[PDB]
Write a protein that binds this ligand. Structure first.
Ligand SMILES: CCCCCCC[C@@H](O)CC(=O)O[C@H]1[C@H](O)[C@@H](CO)O[C@H](OP(=O)(O)OP(=O)(O)OC[C@H]2O[C@@H](n3ccc(=O)[nH]c3=O)[C@H](O)[C@@H]2O)[C@@H]1NC(C)=O
Ligand SMILES: CCCCCCC[C@@H](O)CC(=O)O[C@H]1[C@H](O)[C@@H](CO)O[C@H](OP(=O)(O)OP(=O)(O)OC[C@H]2O[C@@H](n3ccc(=O)[nH]c3=O)[C@H](O)[C@@H]2O)[C@@H]1NC(C)=O
Ligand SMILES: CCCCCCC[C@@H](O)CC(=O)O[C@H]1[C@H](O)[C@@H](CO)O[C@H](OP(=O)(O)OP(=O)(O)OC[C@H]2O[C@@H](n3ccc(=O)[nH]c3=O)[C@H](O)[C@@H]2O)[C@@H]1NC(C)=O
Lengths: 262, 262, 262
């Protein structure tokens, strides 16, 4: 049902069964499918396509020529009723594409809250984007990619299938990520390699001097020590019991399947 | 004429003279020009622009914000009635652009059948795309480019004007192809360089153990022997009279004008 | 007001207050905001969004799915009535985005005349594009970028914020420009480095043999001499009093803030 306080442009096509929340705005020439839920205050500017089994939260801004909930590009997909979930206060810019999941990959593509997805950013099937992320122009995620909280993907940058981009990571523009990126690190190149800790990002996000130092020491254990990952994991765990920010590393290691960028 | 069994959305604009086949679907806000032919069962999802002298075959799926048959980007083009041909069962994704040819370049842009053209793939004037190809997100072909059967162009990858991408080639993502790529080879980098035979692709497509070995030996003649191309061409021709799959090389050599990637 | 000789498609939405010039063409499903001015003979093909405080000149061709005058992607922007200016005889292709300025960056995004902006070219907030430029497919300018007269940005190429691309420059495809590019030079790579003078471009644009030689000598002072920029600036100024084309260098130096690509 469409809430009485929602605006739906006469030219927009909202198919019966769609749920449109209070004070939502559906602009000219938009198409909204029957299995779509659009939250309170969310705006679809114009020329937006939203379909599939897709739930969109509150106060989102979705710009013209964006395609949300669409059939994914995985040749394995066969039309199964898979899902998209999008949180609150996201800015989803022109030509952004966010595709539905696959049964094989868990059935769900997820995007959190307060994200900025710039022009022609691509979120493929079965991706999980967290909160407060930035995907710059043409930033492209292949299937099953995780982008953790506060992570930034630079312009023209592509991420290989199944890769994890750790929390607070900054991936430089014009890059190609082929393996997993630990939280807090700077990555650049093709293939992308690590370039230290995202110190400036952490400073701006309120991380203490002590926390940043501990994170830098954890980085040094991984990349400078010359030891194997299995050797340094318990050392990182010991460090984490004093500095809880370091726990991001161990949580990341348990999820990592592609190996680390080096 | 529009076939009686074709669906044309009330909001779609199909100009008089356009030919729409049986059980075709023209979605909301589509524009179809007077010199366009759309084949049986072909679907234009929504917000699709098809114009120029353009023939589209059967069972195609063309997604929103795609531009098919449009004026090309060659500054030499002056509005001449050039052409686009598109075959059957293609999946042409959001924002894909396929441009009409130029008189100078032969007057025709051609795409075969069973191709997957991912988001924002670009097929410039006078290009020839074969059958069963994959162009990943943002894959960009300059004018007069050939992409032969089964070839794959990775995400964010650009191909220089007049280049040929051989049959069964896999070009890696984030690459820049400046010269001709022989059939069956893996290419990566900027500028792109060869990295052996696409063994896995050939295995999946039913190539025999003997054929793959012969193809590998042909690759070795080209790249490992240290001999000139003119020296190894007759040797490849001799090999081809036992293994007919090797004939792909000699057929490719006759078309090649840019020299080989090395 | 809409001029009596202008065409506005019944499906187009031109908001009251918009100024549409003589013999302009507003195609199907276009949206034109109340603070937009569209000049004599300008064509919006179809599915074009033009909003904000935006002035567009004469004889422009703006293609489907383009977004002109839109809210920029700078997180600092807060909805202030900033501006876009676009000159005459530009060809603005499918999915091109040109964003309004920011108060912080001067309030204006400017594009001159006779430019070709290819598919999905991006002109960010506070950019200044001159005359006769070419931005190829997916060419991406970050905020506050200057692209001077006749400059060419290759396909898949990104330019870092605040950078200046000098007059008559050719930036190769698949590149990443991180610093300022002097006029007349060829740039390629990631990060982009200089590769001599754009001799062919200058020849075609009517530059004399003497002028090109002088420009080459200025290039050699900057890059071959081994001297500092401060040492060679007065030498370039001396050369410029015989060959006025060399004055482009000194004018560029005064604007440069990022340092030179080397
Ligand atoms: C990084 C920038 C690229 C742009 C990213 C945006 C694209 C995404 O929206 C779509 C996507 O990533 O889907 C893939 C899916 O994430 C993956 C896992 O589920 O599976 C697929 O990728 P994968 O690497 O597993 O390719 P396949 O094993 O399915 O084979 C697809 C084609 O590649 C050929 N191939 C494969 C391996 C090889 O070594 N050589 C080949 O030629 C093979 O013959 C076939 O034609 C999926 N692909 C296809 C084309 O089906
Ligand atoms: C690889 C990724 C890039 C994106 C690919 C998508 C673009 C295609 O849709 C369009 C396309 O490829 O068309 C070109 C056409 O395939 C070719 C052959 O027919 O001809 C043209 O390319 P080319 O390399 O021949 O350029 P021109 O010789 O026509 O000159 C165009 C501009 O380049 C300038 N130039 C040329 C050479 C040089 O050395 N320096 C220059 O500055 C010249 O002054 C002029 O302003 C065409 N270009 C233009 C801009 O007209
Ligand atoms: C080059 C190809 C990329 C595509 C280009 C197209 C994008 C443009 O349309 C938009 C644009 O360029 O705007 C930026 C604006 O030109 C600039 C100057 O005015 O300011 C901004 O860029 P900047 O480099 O200054 O980034 P900020 O300092 O504003 O911080 C933004 C985010 O980066 C994080 N950051 C910053 C520095 C650092 O070292 N590590 C970080 O994690 C920080 O925490 C925050 O989340 C602006 N960005 C944002 C996201 O606001």
């Amino acid at each position: 049902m469409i809430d009485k306080s929602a605006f739906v442009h006469p030219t927009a096509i909202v198919e019966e069964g769609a749920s449109i929340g209070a004070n939502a705005h559906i602009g000219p020439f938009c198409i909204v499918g029957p299995h779509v839920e659009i939250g309170e205050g969310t705006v679809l500017k114009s020329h937006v396509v939203v379909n599939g089994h897709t739930k969109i939260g509150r106060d989102n801004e979705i710009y013209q020529f964006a395609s949300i909930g669409e059939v994914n590009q995985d040749l394995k997909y066969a039309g199964e009723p898979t899902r998209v979930e999008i949180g609150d206060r996201n800015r989803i810019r022109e030509s952004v594409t966010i595709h539905r999941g696959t049964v094989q990959g868990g059935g769900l593509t997820k995007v959190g809250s307060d994200n900025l997805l710039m022009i022609n950013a691509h979120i493929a099937h079965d991706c999980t984007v967290g909160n407060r992320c930035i995907l710059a122009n043409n930033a492209t995620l292949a299937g099953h990619v995780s982008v953790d909280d506060f992570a930034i993907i630079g312009g023209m940058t592509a991420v290989h299938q199944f890769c994890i981009i750790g929390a607070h990571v900054m991936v430089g523009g014009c890059s190609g990520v082929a393996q997993d990126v630990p939280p807090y690190v700077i990555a650049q190149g093709n293939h992308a390699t690590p370039f230290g800790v995202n110190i400036e990002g952490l400073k701006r996000r309120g991380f203490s001097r002590e926390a940043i130092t501990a994170i830098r020491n954890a980085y040094k254990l991984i990349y400078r020590s010359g030891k194997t990952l299995d050797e340094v994991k318990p050392e990182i765990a010991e460090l984490a019991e004093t500095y809880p920010e370091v726990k991001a590393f161990t949580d990341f290691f348990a999820r990592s399947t592609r190996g680390l960028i080096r």
